[PDB]
């Protein structure tokens, strides 16, 4: 019940939309995806570091909105995450973060991943984080197709998560999926 370390995060890009999904534990709270207005961050790894990073980024994004008088864009948030991670060069957090979002002015979807000291990997297709399943990357590679509609993208990412969960730990596995458009965000739960 108190063991929540680990997990997986999958981010994918469609046509004028993005999808970010994470695994969720069983029933009888701790979700690994957070948002800062219209930028979504999913963190895998040590749970205490995940909570610390979420609190720090909420702090920084609130101050940024108060000063700039506008919400922060995915690229700027990516750079901020990179610099914050690099600050702890010799004591780094045991985390793998993934960022997804849509730029307001341009409408271009954006996803990125980070290493534990902030090296940025900007991918045009998808990002997978976590070490729960080794075949999850292969399943995402086999299922992904460029320029998918939000319904098709949701189906693809949900199928990838379900297939990864089937050949892995079971009896309580759940998923949380976010479909992000320029003006609409949909959050869904998968109990399969």
């Amino acid at each position: 019940p108190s063991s929540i370390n680990g997990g997986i995060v999958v981010a994918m890009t469609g046509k004028d939309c993005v999808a970010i999904a994470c695994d969720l534990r069983l029933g009888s709270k701790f979700e690994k995806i957070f948002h800062y207005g219209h930028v979504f961050l999913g963190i895998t790894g040590l749970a205490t570091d995940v909570t610390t990073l979420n609190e720090m980024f909420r702090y920084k994004t609130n101050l940024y909105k108060l000063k700039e008088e506008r919400a922060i864009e995915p690229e700027t948030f990516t750079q901020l995450v990179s610099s914050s991670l690099y600050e702890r060069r010799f004591g780094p957090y045991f985390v793998g973060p993934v960022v997804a979002g849509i730029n307001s002015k341009s409408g271009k979807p954006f996803i990125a991943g980070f290493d534990l000291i902030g090296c940025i990997d900007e991918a045009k297709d998808f990002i997978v984080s976590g070490t729960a399943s080794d075949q999850l990357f292969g399943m995402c590679e086999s299922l992904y197709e460029p320029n998918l509609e939000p319904e098709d993208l949701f189906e693809t990412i949900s199928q990838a998560l379900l297939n990864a969960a089937d050949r892995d730990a079971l009896s309580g596995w759940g998923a949380v999926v976010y479909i992000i458009k320029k003006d609409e965000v949909v959050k869904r739960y998968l109990k399969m």
Binding site: Y86, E87, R88, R89, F90, G91, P92, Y93, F94, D115, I117, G118, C119, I120, D121, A123, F137
Partner: protein, 209 residues
Amino acid sequence: AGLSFDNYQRNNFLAENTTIVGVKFNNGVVIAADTRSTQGPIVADKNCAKLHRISPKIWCAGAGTAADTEAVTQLIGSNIELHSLYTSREPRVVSALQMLKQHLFKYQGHIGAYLIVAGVDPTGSHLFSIHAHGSTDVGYYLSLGSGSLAAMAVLESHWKQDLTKEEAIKLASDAIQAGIWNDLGSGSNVDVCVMEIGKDAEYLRNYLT
């Protein structure tokens, strides 16, 4: 202040429980790299830009810890921009070399960045290699990365003093191509940057494929 040492003991307790070339030619310098980015044996990105810009006419490419390379390059670029504004003069490659050398020596090799730096300034064209511990060296042609041996073989095969711009570009492209073919770390594309005296820098993304 500075880089933090917090959670060092905690991390210890938890633990207890690329081809880059640079070529000089008669009126400038050329730097070239491959575009394959890997995370272990997995190809993370088939089109990655490894050529970085310290200043409009001073470029570099690195190996080692990627985050360290990027951070050090950006810090030195900020220092170079401020110094150029302060002196109202074009930045010199020697100044960037001095800043990089002293910064790397301060950290006693704990910043894992190995660099090739090429540039053009009012004093001429310059090419340097920089080691993580702070040692620097000068040369007419340099190679770096896991594919550096094949690229160096190609460079030693077809290098001469009187090289034109086109010959230098072809030689750098061939060295990167050899690293691409014979090294598992490289393979996708070739990025080039040509810095010629008296002209703007020319950045060629995906020069070959």
